[PDB]
Design a protein around this ligand. Sequence first.
Ligand SMILES: Nc1ncnc2c1ncn2[C@@H]1O[C@H](COP(=O)(O)OP(=O)(O)O)[C@@H](O)[C@H]1O
Ligand SMILES: [Mg+2]
Ligand SMILES: [Mg+2]
Lengths: 462, 463, 229, 229
Amino acid sequence: DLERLFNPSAIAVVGASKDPSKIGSQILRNLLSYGFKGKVYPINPTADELMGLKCYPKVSDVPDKVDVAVISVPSDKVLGVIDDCGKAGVKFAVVITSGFKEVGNEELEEELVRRAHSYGMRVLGPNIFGYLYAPARLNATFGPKDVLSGNVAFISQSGALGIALMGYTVVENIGISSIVSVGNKADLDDVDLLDFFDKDPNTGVIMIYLEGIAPGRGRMFIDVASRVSLRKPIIVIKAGRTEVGARAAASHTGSIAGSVAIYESAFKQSGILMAKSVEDAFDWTKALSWNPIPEGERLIVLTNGGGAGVQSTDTFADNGIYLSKPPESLIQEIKKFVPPFASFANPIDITGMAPDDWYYMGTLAALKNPDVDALTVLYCQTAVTTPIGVAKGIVDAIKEAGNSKPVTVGMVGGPEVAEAVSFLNKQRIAAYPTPERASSAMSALYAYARARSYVMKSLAVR
Amino acid sequence: NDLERLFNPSAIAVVGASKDPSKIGSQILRNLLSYGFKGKVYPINPTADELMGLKCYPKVSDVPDKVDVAVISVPSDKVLGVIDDCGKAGVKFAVVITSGFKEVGNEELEEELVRRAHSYGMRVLGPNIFGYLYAPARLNATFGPKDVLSGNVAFISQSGALGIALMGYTVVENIGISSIVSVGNKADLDDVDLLDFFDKDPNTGVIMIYLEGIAPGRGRMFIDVASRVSLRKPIIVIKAGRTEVGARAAASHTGSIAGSVAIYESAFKQSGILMAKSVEDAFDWTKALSWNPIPEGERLIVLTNGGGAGVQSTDTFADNGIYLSKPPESLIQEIKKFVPPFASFANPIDITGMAPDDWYYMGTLAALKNPDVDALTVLYCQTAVTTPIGVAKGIVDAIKEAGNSKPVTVGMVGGPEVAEAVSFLNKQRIAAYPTPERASSAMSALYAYARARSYVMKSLAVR
Amino acid sequence: SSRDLLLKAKENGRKSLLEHEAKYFISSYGIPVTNIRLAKSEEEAVNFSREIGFPVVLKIVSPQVVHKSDVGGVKVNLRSEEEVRKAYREIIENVKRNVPNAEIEGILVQEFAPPGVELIIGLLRDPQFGPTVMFGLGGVFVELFRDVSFRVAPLSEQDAESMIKEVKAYKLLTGFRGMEPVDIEAIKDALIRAGRIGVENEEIAEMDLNPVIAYPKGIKVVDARIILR
Amino acid sequence: SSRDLLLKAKENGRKSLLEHEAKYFISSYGIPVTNIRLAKSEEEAVNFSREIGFPVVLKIVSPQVVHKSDVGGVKVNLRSEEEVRKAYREIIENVKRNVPNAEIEGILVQEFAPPGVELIIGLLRDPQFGPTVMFGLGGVFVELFRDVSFRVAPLSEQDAESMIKEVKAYKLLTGFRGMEPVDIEAIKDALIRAGRIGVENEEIAEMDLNPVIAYPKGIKVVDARIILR
Ligand SMILES: Nc1ncnc2c1ncn2[C@@H]1O[C@H](COP(=O)(O)OP(=O)(O)O)[C@@H](O)[C@H]1O
Ligand SMILES: [Mg+2]
Ligand SMILES: [Mg+2]
């Protein structure tokens, strides 16, 4: 159980000093600025006090039960700190420090875990940049000081790319409930964390950067990931999707590349969506974070540009999603205002003449129709419209529809479109600057529906 | 025949301009003036003595001047009349903005338009288009954005709405443009004609085409011209309707079946064209191809401060049939001068997340100067030991100082500071992206063009 | 001239060439075909069989019969002078009952092609791109899986080679259990020449060399249909 | 107990089961196998052949011989007692020179399974995921093209079905030229049971059902390897 890891009463920081460039010092600083409300105990042998907080030379000296110890001492000092933390009854050792199995010092790593376990203490890492948990106002990383608040839990086996992506979440307007750097995964790993995030009402989506899992861990990974997938979508950025990439990953991690093919199959059985890229991972995470899954296959594409419509159709087709005629009721409704040469084959082409308010009317009509399950709205900037006007129309239609059907938006144009897109995403409406990306995102919603259904079937009582 | 005076006219007439600033003709006239066309402009209006400070005439034939190009935005039922007047005036090119022809099932009107234009020795662009732009002539004959960034990319679009939207999107994506051409219905002038002009155009280095389909009996000509163009300038096609259902949607939009998916793909291969499946891939590739030479060899280096980015890069390169090999020992030894011993040198070269800004300058410089290095993709993951802008500026300095030109793409991961740094690079005409996969994809496009061009050369071998 | 076959067929209002005609026309372009002779008597059949070399294959030749197998029209692997003679009478008599009013041009005496790696070489006319060559592996690989490559004619050596390498079933040509690698150069040559046929002969609507058997040395077209416009 | 087979082999320091042992063990899990008899004399070879019914197959059963065909060890499609006797002595002598010191346990007499759609059903142990079932089409489809699907055991019915549909050569199971559709339920059932074998029997390092012939109703395992750890 990881409740006290993510919601500790007391955190000790081992490796903080008067020098603000030290990793431990960065972490203490983040911990204070992000607004941790529990007790923080800087641990330094000589400092009497750090950042206005009373410093202690050992965790065992703290007159309090320290739930979590963040350790950023040199590798040859780590085990010593582990024994002291162990003496103090620390439950969790967050071992920041690198220089273990990833550089070939496997024996040190195993010793670390053994010693920690003989105290009933679990280890996160080593070789990690920390972890963050927004519901507890807890930023125990030396990464960015802040993240946008939300329901996404991001776990990364990669330190550098992980801590960078932590920053990238802000840019891509992804609300985060948690960041976890698991690094070498010597003890606590993806399965343990999925168990916590399963039970976590603050977390609605889980995104994992994953290079590999430990031998003998796979079946439990499938069991837990599948159960999670019944309620919360899991996206995995699989590193080492190729033999050469797997080889690069083995170099980075210090651990052998497992079978690509079996990993993919395990992902399928777990109901997990495998992303081939960061962009796809983030695009899908956005959509999945802000939309329900579709209740049926009646997807409507609404576009003022046929070309955008075709790009969308091709992209949906590449993901095995095919459009059929819209409901007749919807066609007649939209015919009230569109020109006679508007196309109603799906995509519904309301022509490039469409002013802003047609987008409100069309989006509303679609979303209200009981035979429409999902809507992808495409927009091509022309002078008869304003991007922000179209965006506000979409927002108004969504509000007014007062239901929740999946919606993604694709807007192509200049700087005014970039701002409209930013605006939408800030309202938590999945918007992208190309028709293909919006459709890719909508496809993620449907893919999750199918993954969920796969797992449901696979768990059926026989 | 020759499109020299289409793209570089001495005189343009605008038919459909008026005191109403919302009319299409008016929008086009405004763009022509604000963008700064320095030849003669002749507004054509029945009643106005003057539009936008320029003497207006009631017919093109009344203009006391040789009108090269007539931009026509009058209703469809008035077009043929205007064509006759233009024919009388000796107009060589009729840019028929006006929609309401074959795309709406009016095949006979369209064919008649072309027939009429041809009986005067007049060529037609369109109909059903948003115009065309030619930066070298300071010519903006569209009702699209009034301005584009200047450069060497020619963008041709069969789609009006997506085309005019993408026109704006080039600015956001920092793509330097030499020309925009809306070809719409392609009743007369089409991709092959324009490819012939852009072949010869020293201002144009790259051609990007949004393409739904080409006319029956035009394909062989398309391959012969495109392949030749590909020997010197890369061509990217955003193929619309690359799926069957997509082909149907495209047929609805254009009013004519586009054709065989499989055979189009093969024709693109024979032509040495790079087929993009998406707007983003097309733009990412166009950027790299516009700003870099093609690599002279396969010794591609990935330089990264993050293993995760390296793996993403390696995987992505592999999916595009590009595989990395061990870098030169000279370069390894050079890098070993400053990186820690637990740095990885297998390619990607991992200089570790501990790397400060100047390591990016030093590593990039060493790589680029090395005679056994052909290409470089630089990956950066933001950490507190670095600054994004510092890393970017280190890269810029390295490129300059190497004093050669090897292809380079950059991938930077991080918050708003990374977005600004990436923006900064692209504005230096250095292909930069907010992900490692996109950076590698861009680099993969350079290599893809190299292989495509070699394909064409081989296919053209004597005997 | 080989074009006499196309002209004759058109003059007699035929929309396709007969089997032996198609193969003559194919052969004249340098595409290797089964050694064939048209028999007009059971006696000519034995003679031609002795010329061609046993075993032989006997097929009925008629516009009225386009599925030889369903009407008793094809007898395969005939090893001796009179295996063919009884077979001749079996065909000739079989045809009367299943379609009694059919024209007999004759019975085609054919080379029995040994087994190998079966191929399909197609030629069609695309509205955009004109004559287009199609390649694929025989059997279920084209018919079921549609594993096929296209190149617009004329074909360069580069096109021919690359389109062969393109198909998913390409490894079937480069050796596998119980089968040596086959003559890829020979295949490329047939592809190029097939492209030439389409480009030059405007009256040919499409052409299907199916099956085509590739050996470690050389290839042989076993059947060929040619459709006219 | 069937586990006695594993234990016996273990006690005799063997790292694999013989064909008949493997088939007994597989069959006891409900996976259909070829009717088999171990002949200890040529008279039993003839006798058992008349028991099961011609045509038959004769194989060597010996720990020292693990590629039976490759040593002259397999005689297939024996139509009559005379073919079988020729085959029996042909095996013994073939095996004698090429593998001269082999203990011969006997000769396995088998029903010559009719032609059908060949399958491969595998079981391996992946370091991460433990017992993993592998499925694919036989011949060049797995052997050359590497077209296979995997599921981590135990398999649900959903896993079995989807992994079958997953392989590129799936259409070979749903009917094509010269072949009716085959029993998909039988295949799914076999996959699930192979998964159970792996999960339950820790001492089985891997298992290879190859070939497995699928028919319009039911399937039959023709050869089976079981490796012990
Ligand atoms: N009982 C049988 N019925 C039908 N065909 C069989 C039978 N046993 C084997 N075969 C066929 O003949 C081959 C004989 O080889 P096999 O028994 O699989 O082992 P090995 O690989 O040692 O030769 C098989 O691969 C299969 O193609
Ligand atoms: Mg339209
Ligand atoms: Mg690292």
